[PDB]
Amino acid sequence: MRVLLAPMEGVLDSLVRELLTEVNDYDLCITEFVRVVDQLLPVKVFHRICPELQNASRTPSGTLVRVQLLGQFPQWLAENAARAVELGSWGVDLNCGCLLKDPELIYQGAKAMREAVPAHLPVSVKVRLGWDSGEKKFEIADAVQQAGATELVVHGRTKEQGYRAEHIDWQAIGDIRQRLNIPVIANGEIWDWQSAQQCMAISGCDAVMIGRGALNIPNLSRVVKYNEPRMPWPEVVALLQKYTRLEHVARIKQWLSYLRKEYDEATELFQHVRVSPDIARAIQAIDIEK
Numbered sequence: 001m002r003v004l005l006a007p008m009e010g011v012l013d014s015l016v017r018e019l020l021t022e023v024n025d026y027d028l029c030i031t032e033f034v035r036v037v038d039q040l041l042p043v044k045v046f047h048r049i050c051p052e053l054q055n056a057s058r059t060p061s062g063t064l065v066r067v068q069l070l071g072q073f074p075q076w077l078a079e080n081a082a083r084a085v086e087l088g089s090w091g092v093d094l095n096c097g098c099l100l101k102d103p104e105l106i107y108q109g110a111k112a113m114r115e116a117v118p119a120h121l122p123v124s125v126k127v128r129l130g131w132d133s134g135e136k137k138f139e140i141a142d143a144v145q146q147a148g149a150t151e152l153v154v155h156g157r158t159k160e161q162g163y164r165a166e167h168i169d170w171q172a173i174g175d176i177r178q179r180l181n182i183p184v185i186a187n188g189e190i191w192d193w194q195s196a197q198q199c200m201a202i203s204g205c206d207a208v209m210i211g212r213g214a215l216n217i218p219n220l221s222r223v224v225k226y227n228e229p230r231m232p233w234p235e236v237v238a239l240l241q242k243y244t245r246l247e248h249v250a251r252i253k254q255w256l257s258y259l260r261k262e263y264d265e266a267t268e269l270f271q272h273v274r275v276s277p278d279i280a281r282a283i284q285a286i287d288i289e290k
């Protein structure tokens, strides 16, 4: 089984990647997107989004990270893809879900990137089922394969369905997988060991990507792969303590907000820390127990 850590712009950055990968077995993390328009972005932008590039594309604990690009113009997707790779990125990812209601644009963008990235390095594309309909989710999928992309992440909802749980369609992901000859990584609504098993049995995918769930349960990759139990609240606290010592984070409150769905003890700690960065002391104060 492969488990990928999703890109979560405004939630996951290099610090949380280093934190999480330490206590997980993610096969690969995708960075938050590098926004591409019509310019080659400076080296400094890539290093800042992806500090791992200077560590052979790995978090300190050794988990691979891949730079993601977001954009439309194939020429510039290609030049930025080449630069990502020159700087050390283990392949490059293309965001087509945060998007493109034209399979031709996905085809051209991914192709330019494939040709611009050294053939032995992966070029992956992340998509949704469709814009306002999942009709010809095959067109999109065909586009990606025909472009020469290495693998396809499919978020099992259309753009309009947003993040509504009742709209997740793992079977659609399966129909795409049956049709293609590159790996399909199932994404969306994977929260625990059982939902992962349900997803893979229905889609037939042996690879999944987890986003929001990876914050609700900090060791979700090990939960999914090994049916490890969820990380114990004292360990979560110990982890949030380590987070404070990694150095300005208001993402801490955001994380605690995520943790409220799974850990009862998080709702009180959320209220405490909600309402200056003395929050560091408050968190660092707690004795583990309990």
Ligand SMILES: Cc1cc2nc3c(=O)[nH]c(=O)nc-3n(C[C@H](O)[C@H](O)[C@H](O)COP(=O)(O)O)c2cc1C
Pocket (backbone or CB within 6 Å): 006, 007, 008, 009, 010, 011, 031, 032, 033, 068, 095, 096, 097, 098, 126, 155, 187, 188, 189, 190, 209, 210, 211, 212, 213
């Ligand atoms: C806050 C937030 C930020 C996201 N940022 C990105 C992103 O930068 N690039 C991308 O391809 N998808 C992004 N996504 C989409 C997710 O990676 C993922 O496909 C989606 O959350 C569904 O997976 P999940 O149900 O496991 O969370 C983002 C989603 C959320 C909620």
